[PDB]
Ligand binder design. Structure first.
Ligand SMILES: Nc1nc(NCCN2CCC(c3ccccc3)CC2)nc2nc(-c3ccco3)nn12
Ligand SMILES: CC(C)CCC[C@@H](C)[C@H]1CC[C@H]2[C@@H]3CC=C4C[C@@H](O)CC[C@]4(C)[C@H]3CC[C@]12C
Ligand SMILES: CC(C)CCC[C@@H](C)[C@H]1CC[C@H]2[C@@H]3CC=C4C[C@@H](O)CC[C@]4(C)[C@H]3CC[C@]12C
Ligand SMILES: CC(C)CCC[C@@H](C)[C@H]1CC[C@H]2[C@@H]3CC=C4C[C@@H](O)CC[C@]4(C)[C@H]3CC[C@]12C
Ligand SMILES: CC(C)CCC[C@@H](C)[C@H]1CC[C@H]2[C@@H]3CC=C4C[C@@H](O)CC[C@]4(C)[C@H]3CC[C@]12C
Ligand SMILES: CCCCCCCC/C=C/CCCCCCCC(=O)OC[C@@H](O)CO
Ligand SMILES: CCCCCCCC/C=C\CCCCCCCC(=O)OC[C@@H](O)CO
Ligand SMILES: CCCCCCCC/C=C\CCCCCCCC(=O)OC[C@@H](O)CO
Ligand SMILES: CCCCCCCC/C=C\CCCCCCCC(=O)OC[C@@H](O)CO
Ligand SMILES: CCCCCCCC/C=C\CCCCCCCC(=O)OC[C@@H](O)CO
Ligand SMILES: CCCCCCCC/C=C\CCCCCCCC(=O)OC[C@@H](O)CO
Ligand SMILES: CCCCCCCC/C=C\CCCCCCCC(=O)OC[C@@H](O)CO
Ligand SMILES: CCCCCCCC/C=C\CCCCCCCC(=O)OC[C@H](O)CO
Ligand SMILES: CCCCCCCC/C=C\CCCCCCCC(=O)O
Ligand SMILES: CCCCCCCC/C=C\CCCCCCCC(=O)O
Ligand SMILES: CCCCCCCC/C=C\CCCCCCCC(=O)O
Ligand SMILES: CCCCCCCC/C=C\CCCCCCCC(=O)O
Ligand SMILES: CCCCCCCC/C=C\CCCCCCCC(=O)O
Ligand SMILES: CCCCCCCC/C=C\CCCCCCCC(=O)O
Ligand SMILES: CCCCCCCC/C=C\CCCCCCCC(=O)O
Ligand SMILES: CCCCCCCC/C=C\CCCCCCCC(=O)O
Ligand SMILES: CCCCCCCC/C=C\CCCCCCCC(=O)O
Ligand SMILES: CCCCCCCC/C=C\CCCCCCCC(=O)O
Ligand SMILES: CCCCCCCC/C=C\CCCCCCCC(=O)O
Ligand SMILES: CCCCCCCC/C=C\CCCCCCCC(=O)O
Ligand SMILES: CCCCCCCC/C=C\CCCCCCCC(=O)O
Ligand SMILES: CCCCCCCC/C=C\CCCCCCCC(=O)O
Ligand code: NA
Length: 392
């Protein structure tokens, strides 16, 4: 009619989809290759990273070819059409499970580092990954379980396209119910987990900030109470300061040169405490001055290393949170459009070109994670360089 031949816009959409598919495959194969090759990348966190890269490889290999297919409106048995339409929901759900697992993994690592290695193992991670893939199929293919529009085929459209008996024009919104897409897929299965992830990341950053402040508080307490002892004028004041220092030292103690340093510190505090209890103020103060040598030669090195470890965990959690935020940024437009279609039947449907933009944007998310790893994680970046240099 008055509209341009459909193959022209179709050709642009399909070409862009194929470009995205190539890049999603290439980048995420590289991710999987790096983890396979580099033992420094083989940890539980990165097993979920690989599960996420696998979902993104399958966006390129399967979901994008399926999206290209369903954009034609080809004649199909309705339940086969549903599979074509819904398989991408499986991969998105799997991604959400991987993203949530990564957040939780980093929370356990910062909140209870002493039991992380005993609690979060590779064997348990592989079990969780398998369970999450099964649940992703069940959630994303729930329309194949009967929550579909196949009982109400658009017969006039099927007839105009010459479809056979029992077939429909395979179009996403004709077969997939929008109440499923909004209430079940978006609200329950996407939005709630993303808000949960946000809460987990808030807890991670709050715990890091609290632990860093506790490190500096213990350091300040050590130096303040040293001054208190130096300008004390009786044995009772030295004793009070040393008793608070001994509790802090044990509290900071909670590796061989680390343990020797705290062993020295507590012993030296005990030395001065014994002199103080005998009422020997000058001798107690001189004994407490020895603590400065231990503080410079050991304690300050522990403080710097503890701080450095925490800042690396903050940096790693920020990298993970960026990937979760980019998943939300890339998928929200499509979900929001579905909300308008569903909740505002008096509003004109979002136009075809905008839907395809939103679909392309969702698919582009399967391209971006390898770049975040390359730019933010040195161990990935260096391994990528080795693979590319040695093999391309
Ligand atoms: N909703 C939706 N559609 C499609 N494809 C059909 C596009 N067609 C939808 C109708 C539109 C139209 C415009 C003006 C007048 C009538 C009709 C044309 C354009 N694919 C999807 N994927 C996800 C999706 C996956 C995860 C969350 O949402 N929603 N969705
Ligand atoms: C392991 C991988 C590579 C295999 C991929 C198999 C895919 C391509 C197969 C599995 C099930 C198939 C669908 C099953 C039924 C129908 C209904 C029919 O009227 C049109 C084709 C259609 C829509 C098929 C398209 C192709 C399909 C999606
Ligand atoms: C054994 C594994 C590896 C195969 C992968 C399973 C998927 C891709 C295939 C296997 C069998 C397929 C189904 C076989 C037959 C039909 C009946 C038709 O009316 C609609 C499609 C539908 C419902 C297919 C949907 C997709 C399907 C579930
Ligand atoms: C997730 C972040 C980036 C926000 C994205 C907001 C996008 C998805 C929003 C902002 C403005 C919105 C549009 C505002 C008005 C209309 C006209 C109505 O007849 C159909 C929906 C439609 C076309 C909306 C679709 C969704 C929309 C494009
Ligand atoms: C934390 C944030 C990102 C959650 C996402 C917010 C979503 C659920 C919000 C943002 C804008 C909202 C839409 C804004 C306007 C309208 C038009 C109205 O006639 C029906 C509801 C509808 C369609 C809203 C539905 C819900 C909506 C899509
Ligand atoms: C149409 C059907 C298409 C096929 C869909 C199949 C989707 C299932 C894909 C699953 C990919 C999962 C890969 C994820 C692999 C993660 C690595 C791992 O778990 O190893 C850790 C342990 O070994 C350490 O002890
Ligand atoms: C289907 C899409 C492609 C999926 C590919 C998944 C391949 C994952 C391969 C990369 C993970 C290998 C691994 O983690 O081994 C760890 C063990 O050595 C424990 O130390
Ligand atoms: C490689 C290229 C494979 C893509 C081949 C897909 C061809 C479908 C097409 O272009 O027409 C349908 C649209 O006009 C919808 O109206
Ligand atoms: C593996 C990667 C392959 C992806 C291809 C996606 C499936 C391609 C879907 C086939 C289209 C079709 O069946 O048309 C004929 C019908 O109209 C019968 O009436
Ligand atoms: C291993 C990789 C396997 C790759 C298999 C290739 C799949 C390409 C699927 C696209 C080919 C499927 C579309 C062919 C078709 O539907 O034409 C006839 C109809 O138009 C008449 O109604
Ligand atoms: C955060 C979660 C946000 C949920 C927002 C859902 C609100 C959507 C509620 C829309 C109800 C409505 O549109 O009724 C219209 C009728 O008058 C018929 O046109
Ligand atoms: C967390 C997100 C949870 C959100 C709960 C919001 C419930 C919103 C419930 C709105 C019900 C409605 O009026 O739907 C009308 C449609 O049928 C179209 O007319
Ligand atoms: C926990 C997750 C475990 C996964 C369990 C799945 C049950 C298998 C259900 C098999 C569904 C077959 C449905 C079907 O073939 O037809 C349905 C109907 O025709 C549509 O309208
Ligand atoms: C990311 C790359 C940005 C490029 C954006 C171009 C992609 C899609 C908009 C093209 C308009 C055609 C819509 C689809 C028409 C159809 O399905 O037949
Ligand atoms: C590179 C992508 C290849 C170009 C594909 C164009 C599609 C042709 C068509 O729609 O008929
Ligand atoms: C996005 C694209 C990243 C491209 C990476 C190019 C080299 C990867 C080669 C490969 O391992 O398959
Ligand atoms: C389409 C699916 C493509 C997925 C590719 C993922 C690549 C990553 C790991 C595959 C396992 C490695 C197999 C050969 C190993 C060779 C060796 O270690 O010497
Ligand atoms: C690495 C393996 C990747 C798989 C390659 C497949 C790429 C082909 C892309 C899209 C499939 C085209 C489907 C055409 C729909 C039929 C149109 C119609 O019947 O009207
Ligand atoms: C292996 C990669 C797939 C190989 C070739 C892709 C060719 C797909 C041709 C689609 C035909 C579309 C049509 O006939 O309507
Ligand atoms: C829910 C569907 C359940 C599927 C069974 C998955 C098999 C993996 C079990 C391993 C459990 C684990 O080690 O944590
Ligand atoms: C709903 C039943 C269909 C289940 C098929 C998909 C499950 C794939 C199984 C394991 C995913 C990879 C295991 C990780 C090691
Ligand atoms: C739960 C996982 C899959 C259920 C859907 C299987 C295909 C149903 C059509 C026959
Ligand atoms: C569509 C919603 C899914 C419905 C709920 C399904 C219930 C599955 C829940 C948890 C799985 C727990 C893992 C148990 C592993 C058992 C392994 C074994 O028996 O050998
Ligand atoms: C719904 C939107 C929420 C999506 C964001 C999810 C994770 C990023 C966390 C931000 C860190 C604070
Ligand atoms: C809805 C977002 C959920 C908020 C989660 C609580 C965060 C608690 C905190 O760390 O301060
Ligand atoms: C540039 C990318 C598009 C950005 C925003 C789209 C906002 C409104 C889209 C057009 C509405 C079409 C209509 O309802 O008539
Ligand atoms: C064809 C459009 C593909 C665009 C993908 C953009 C994502 C890559 C990230 C940084 C460059
Ligand atoms: Na993904």
């Amino acid at each position: 009619d008055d509209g341009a031949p459909p193959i022209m816009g179709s050709s642009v959409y399909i070409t862009v989809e194929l470009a995205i598919a190539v890049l999603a495959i290439l980048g995420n194969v590289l991710v999987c290759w790096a983890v396979w090759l580099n033992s420094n990348l083989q940890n539980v966190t990165n097993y979920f990273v690989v599960s996420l890269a696998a979902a993104d490889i399958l966006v390129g290999v399967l979901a994008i070819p399926f999206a290209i297919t369903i954009s034609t409106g080809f004649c199909a048995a309705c339940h086969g059409c549903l599979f074509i339409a819904c398989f991408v929901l499986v991969l998105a759900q799997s991604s959400i499970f991987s993203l949530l697992a990564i957040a939780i993994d980093r929370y356990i690592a910062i909140a209870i580092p002493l039991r992380y290695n005993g609690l979060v193992t590779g064997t348990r991670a592989a079990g969780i990954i398998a369970i999450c893939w099964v649940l992703s199929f069940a959630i994303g293919l729930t329309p194949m379980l009967g929550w579909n529009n196949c009982g109400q085929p658009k017969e006039g459209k099927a007839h105009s396209q010459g479809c056979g008996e029992g077939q429909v024009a395979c179009l996403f919104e004709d077969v997939v119910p929008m109440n499923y897409m909004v209430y079940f897929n978006f609200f329950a299965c996407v939005l709630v987990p993303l808000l949960l992830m946000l809460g987990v990341y808030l807890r991670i950053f709050a715990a890091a900030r609290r632990q860093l402040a506790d490190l500096e508080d213990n350091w300040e307490t050590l130096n303040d109470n040293l001054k208190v002892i130096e300008k004390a004028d009786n044995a009772a004041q030295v004793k009070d300061a040393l008793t608070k220092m001994r509790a802090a030292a044990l509290d900071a103690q909670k590796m061989k040169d680390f343990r020797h340093g705290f062993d020295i510190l507590v012993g030296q505090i005990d030395d001065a405490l014994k002199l103080a209890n005998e009422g020997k103020v000058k001798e107690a103060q001189a004994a407490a001055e020895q603590l400065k040598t231990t503080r410079n030669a050991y304690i300050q090195k522990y403080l710097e290393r503890a701080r450095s470890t925490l800042q690396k965990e903050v940096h790693a959690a920020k990298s993970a949170a960026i990937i979760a935020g980019l998943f939300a940024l890339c998928w929200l437009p499509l979900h929001i459009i579905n909300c308008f279609t569903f909740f505002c039947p008096d509003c004109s449907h979002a136009p075809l070109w905008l839907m395809y933009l939103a679909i392309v944007l969702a698919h582009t998310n399967s391209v971006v994670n390898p770049f975040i790893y390359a730019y933010r994680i040195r161990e990935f970046r260096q391994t990528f360089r080795k693979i590319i240099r040695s093999h391309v």
